[PDB]
Every structure is written in structure tokens, then in C-alpha cells.
Amino acid sequence: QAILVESGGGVVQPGRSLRLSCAASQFTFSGHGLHWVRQAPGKGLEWVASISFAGTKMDYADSVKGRFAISRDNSKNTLYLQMNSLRVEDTALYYCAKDMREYECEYWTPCIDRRGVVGIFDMWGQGTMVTVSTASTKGPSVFPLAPSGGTAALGCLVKDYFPEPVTVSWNSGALTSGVHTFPAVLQSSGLYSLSSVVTVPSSSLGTQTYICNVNHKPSNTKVDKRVEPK
Amino acid sequence: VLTQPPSVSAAPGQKVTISCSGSSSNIGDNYVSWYQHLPGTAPKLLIYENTRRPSGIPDRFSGSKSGTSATLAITGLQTGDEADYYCGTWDVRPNRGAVFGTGTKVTVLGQPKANPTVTLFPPSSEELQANKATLVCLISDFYPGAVTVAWKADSSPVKAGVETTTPSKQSNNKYAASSYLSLTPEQWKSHRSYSCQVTHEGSTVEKTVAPT
């Protein structure tokens, strides 16, 4: 029944501010408290903030204390997260979450009922990604991974690009057998790298051409690198 | 801080249990929820108030609590149960928020084990010419999708400049992974040998490379 849709995520520099929004639908928004939770790449869930149904109680994790502010607008069934003084360590996928308990305002002058949240996250959105980095937009350098029963592996290293993602094809999409493109790794340099690999008949080498087609929209680049036996 | 083991595995139809152990301040007099999370989707409430389920989550899932150590249990394991599971407690009692488990990855052994094939590429001449050096270790055709990688330079363990990806499913439903070792051209040239050692299900497969 209930639906939550986060927006406002992107790539930003440390020290700047960014506001996230969550559009709630198909339940009585004004009657429920709400939560923000984040998951940094390849890690667990980490609670960031909560707000009670009447918006009178606000709670934050000590890691975001003083920097983040949670708010709501019942008129728009929207939950907000104002993130100021952003740090690289704030990089994560941010989820909006509804709290299970429904309340009816019991104290007025508008509602300022102080009954807090129960803390059971009964509905979650798909989340919005926030990336905080000192890096600037940069297309990849593409380096060949040369080969050398009756099979050989070859690929291309797509290195030092920012931000995600890159896409990879082989021979303009005519070669799709045995191809595997790996997830990206984040180097200490703050630039991403990944690799794509294909296994091909060792017999065809020296005659058959294999081209790695790399695309990085953020920097508006298309690279077509040849990978030969050498 | 709610601590869970990193992983658990079992064949289909079998039962697994995931424990969430914590202190007496967080757990002890607070209820415990459980959340399922499939990587490409929104997290999902499985259990709340220790043992209650928000249907239609099936009774194959059950929760319990032993003073200060909650336990999720999953019977009749099926493919669709493969996900990350987290416990969580709310201790705004007062002013302290929610805490989540660490948590735990559930694997369903749905095919026989396959040993990894290891391919180690040295740095390309083109890369050295760009004043960089990267060893690329590609691992393929293994199941289950879990491995650890260890790099060595002249038989000595190397941790610096190492990056590894979490195993991803190939088109043939086995897994692949990748690991990188970043060096300078001088480093690459100043050692006689480098090796990528992949451990999968207690056994190791190793490849070595050297300048020329």
C-alpha cells in the first residue's frame, strides 16, 4: 500500500550543502513519524535521523549532529533532510523510512503532540545516492589486457574516471559471449577503476579484431581501444 | 552496537539462524526488529517486537530473544531468501536513536561447488608509458560466490594499494571477482615476481607474473 520516493541525490564537494526530499504516498503521512537511514557502498545500514509524527521531536546520530536537520511538510506529504558541511564519509545511498505507529494529534496550538517514534521501519524507499568527493569530473584512461582448451582471456582496464558509471561493450555489441564487466573499485586517489573481460577462441587470435568500447557520459567520452596479443 | 556474524549458508530446504548480540543498554529492555535487504531493492521489515511478523511475510521466518541476544531463524530456505539480514533496536530512551546489526549475508547452496579460474595480467606497456602500473587479477567460474585474495611481491605479503570487488554473478550463474594491485613503474620493475592468490572454500589457486 504505502509508497516512499527519495529525490535530490547527486555528486557534491565536501563542505557544501545538499537537501534531500522524500515523497510519501498511499498512507496517512500526518499520522506517522519518519526516518532517514544510509548505506555506504559495500557496508551496513546506519541510522541518521528521525522525526515524530507532529514534527516536535528530532533525533540524530552523533556523526551528523549539528550538520544535518530533519523536517517535514504535511501539506506536501514530504520529508526532508538538510545536509550541511558534507564530508567524504557522508557518501552513501540514503533511504526514507516510515515508522510503524500511527498517531492522532492530541495536543494543539499546529499539532505539537510530543509522543515520539517507536522506531520500527515498516516501509522503505529505494533510496537516493549521495556522493561526496574532492575529485572533479574525469574520463577514463583505457589500457588493454592482452592474452598469452583452445581459449584465451583478454580485456580492458578502465582506469581513473569520475563519477560512476561507465559502460562497456565489445566490437560494438556484436560480441556478447563470455563477456563479463566487473563492478567498479574506488581507489585511495578518489578515482574509480573497473575491468571488462572476454574469453575467446585462441585459434582466432592474430586474425580476429577485438575492440573495447568504453563510454563515460559524465565527461562525455567514448573510447574504442584495441586489444591485441602483442 | 549490535554484532552479527558476517555470513551463513545452507542448502535449499534447510534451516539457518542469525544471531544479534548486544549490550544491556541497547538490548535488554528494548524490542528487536529484523530487516531483509536484497542489494537492488528497498530494505524490508521481516520481524518487529521480537517475534511478530508484518504479513505477508511467511512463517518460515521467526524471531526470538534471550535477554540481550536476539535470533532470527529461517526454515525451508529458498533461493529468494538470499539477501543481507539486519537486526535493529530503538533506544530513544532517551535521546539515543536506532542502532542496526552489522549484519549478515545469507547464501543458499543451489549448485555444486566450482573451483575458481585465475587470470593475472601484468601492467600493459601502454600503461607503463602512462607512468602507472596495475596488476589485474580476474577470477571466474566459481561457486559459491565468496573468495579472499592475497597479493605478494617477491613472496612477501602486500596490502598497500590493493582493491577488490565483491563476487558478481556471471551469465552462466557462476561468479566472478576482480582484484587490483597498484604500483609505480619503479616498484613493478624493482621486484622479480608478483603473485595473486585466491582462496575459495579453503583451497588456493595462485598465478604469478614478472617483468619479462
Q: Compute the distance between CA of residue A131 and CA of residue A204 in angstroms, rounded to an integer.
A: 43
The answer to whether the Cβ–Cβ distance between A121 and B33 falls below 8 Å is yes
What was the elucidation method?
Answer: X-ray
Residue of A nearest to B122 (CA): A145
Q: Long-range contacts made by residues B109-112, C-beta under 8 angstroms, separation at least 24?
A: B109/B9, B109/B10, B109/B11, B109/B12, B109/B144, B110/B11, B110/B12, B110/B79, B111/B143, B111/B173, B112/B143
Q: Give the position of cell 582496464.
A: A157
A182/B124 CB distance under 8 A: no
Q: How many residues are listed for chain A in this entry?
A: 230
Task: Report whether A153 contacts A205 (CB < 8 A).
Answer: no
**Which residue of B99, B127, B171 is in closest CB contact with A143?**
B127
In angstroms, the CA A185 to CA A168 distance is: 15
Chain B closest CA to A4's CA: distance in Å? 10
Distance from the Cα of B52 to chain A's closest Cα (Å) equals 12
Distance CA A72, CA A60 (A): 15
Q: Answer yes or no: do B124 and A143 touch at CB < 8 A.
A: yes
Residue contact B33–A143, C-beta within 8 A = no
Asked if B162 contacts B151 with a C-beta cutoff of 8 angstroms, the reply is: yes
Inform me whether the C-beta atom of residue A3 falls under 8 Å from chain B C-beta atoms: no
What are the phi and psi torsion angles at B93 (to 5°)?
Answer: -135, 65
Q: DSSP readout, A37-103? A: EEE-TTS-EEEEEEE-TTS--EEE-TTTTTTEEEEEEGGGTEEEEEE-S--GGG-EEEEEEEEEEE-
Nearest Cα neighbor of A185 from A212, A167, A161 is A161
Q: How many CB atoms lie within 10 A of CB A60?
A: 20
Domains in chain A and their CATH numbers? Answer: 1-134 (2.60.40.10), 135-230 (2.60.40.10)
Neighbours of B208 (CB within 10 A): 12
* Domains delineated in chain B: 1-110 (2.60.40.10), 111-211 (2.60.40.10)
B43: nearest CB among A95, A179, A182 = A95
> Which amino acid belongs to residue A204?
S
- What resolution, expressed in A, was reported for this entry? 1.9
B189–chain A nearest CA distance, Å? 18
- What Cα–Cα distance (Å) separates residue A83 from each residue in A17, A18, B163? 5, 5, 30
> CA-to-CA distance for B145 and B139, rounded, in angstroms?
11
What's the CA gap between B27 and B71, in Å, rounded? 12
Minimum distance, in Å, between the CA of residue A226 and any CA atom of chain B: 12
Contacts of B44 in chain A (CB under 8 A): 124
Question: Using CA atoms, how far apart are residues A139 and B124, in angstroms rounded to an integer?
Answer: 19
Say if residues B18 and B8 touch (Cβ distance below 8 Å).
yes
